[PDB]
């Protein structure tokens, strides 16, 4: 079958250069145009440009003309998207897609490459308790604060607790660091006996943390 495979996620700093790739297989790569599509976080799809790998004939969308270079290496069935100087506003998911010339549809898509551009540096999270009451449905949780970059993983009781768990999307703080909460609703009668521990892992900084969450004393 037709497949488009894109290179791995990128975390970069402003002013750095970058070239991401897209390899086609299961068809003649030099026979079809390949498009590049930008998707900013929580935003819509934007056409960036297109290339015919047979001869590297290229069209750019006016908004991306002079901003990026689209290229291809047909000897290895690969199309490229590149920046010489990244900006934080380049943060986005980038898709490559095959264009079929008859009706102009994009019929097969790559899995996407996530590019994160920030002046922030790698930093492990601090994990703070969201404590349940010490005096019915109760809520408790963990605040996973001041980390970079995404992602973190959160489990409860090493994966033994999944019911009532909500792990929220992270927010980006003005500091450029992320903050995330993970909560669980439980019976208030379980609070005295049942142990609740959040298991947090942040691979990029190699920071692994277990935080026991319990009612506080006054």
């Amino acid at each position: 079958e037709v497949q488009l495979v894109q290179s791995g996620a990128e975390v970069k700093k402003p002013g750095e250069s970058l070239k991401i790739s897209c390899k086609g297989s299961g068809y003649s790569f030099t026979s079809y145009w390949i498009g590049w599509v930008r998707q900013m976080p929580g935003k819509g799809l934007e056409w960036m440009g297109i290339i015919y790998p047979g001869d590297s004939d290229t069209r750019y969308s006016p908004s991306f003309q002079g901003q990026v270079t689209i290229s291809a290496d047909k000897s290895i069935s690969t199309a490229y998207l590149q920046w010489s100087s990244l900006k934080a506003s380049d943060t986005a998911m980038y898709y490559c897609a095959r264009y079929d010339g008859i009706y102009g549809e994009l019929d097969f898509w790559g899995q996407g490459t996530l590019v994160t551009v920030s002046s922030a540096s790698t930093k492990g999270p601090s994990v703070f308790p969201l404590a349940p009451s010490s005096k019915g449905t109760a809520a408790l949780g963990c605040l996973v604060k001041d980390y970079f970059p995404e992602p973190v993983t959160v489990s409860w009781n090493s994966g033994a607790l999944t019911s009532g768990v909500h792990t929220f999307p992270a927010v980006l703080q003005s500091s450029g660091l992320y903050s995330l909460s993970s909560v669980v609703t439980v019976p208030s009668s379980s609070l005295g006996t049942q142990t609740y521990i959040c298991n947090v892992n942040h691979k990029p900084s190699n920071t692994k943390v277990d935080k026991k969450v319990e009612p506080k004393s006054c």
Partner: protein, 214 residues
Amino acid sequence: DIQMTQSPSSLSASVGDRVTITCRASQSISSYLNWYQQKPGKAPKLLIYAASSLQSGVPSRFSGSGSGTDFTLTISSLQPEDFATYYCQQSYSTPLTFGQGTKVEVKRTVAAPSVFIFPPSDEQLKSGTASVVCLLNNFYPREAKVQWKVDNALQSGNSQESVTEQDSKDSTYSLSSTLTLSKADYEKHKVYACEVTHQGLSSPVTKSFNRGEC
């Protein structure tokens, strides 16, 4: 050079409902109009090409109609898997352009949030920052308003919030909101309140604590 306008930007509908999404072009694009489906965390997927032709593999509940400037995607009877974001796209003339997208989410009975508040930890306070967290759990619809109050002063600009994806089992949302203030600011004031407004509540629900309480 050709602008695509989708309507609505967001849509709520029950399983088995007829769903219609409209796409309008700034000029006649003949029949060169495509529809894509995008699920959260996944790549867009072609549903319909040339305005009305179904891509192979796509169920017959999906159909498209229209020519010139006006186009509609129809899902005849919604299924759980159809909940996603949908984009139209013209390939009539370069530069090729997408519509802004339409999110289709599951309609269910209105459910009021269960509200919880969390004081900052002593560990965090030692670092010079206080995070106060308010949880709105298992509510519908998505639209909800959190108003932080510190000694009756309404807070603005010093909070951030996020919402979970719609729950696949119960069709609800949950929202987490963090009020962030300095340790010095936190210790100067006493009453911390999270006021929640939502269609499911006849009047706003407030959860509060006095700094020191546990």
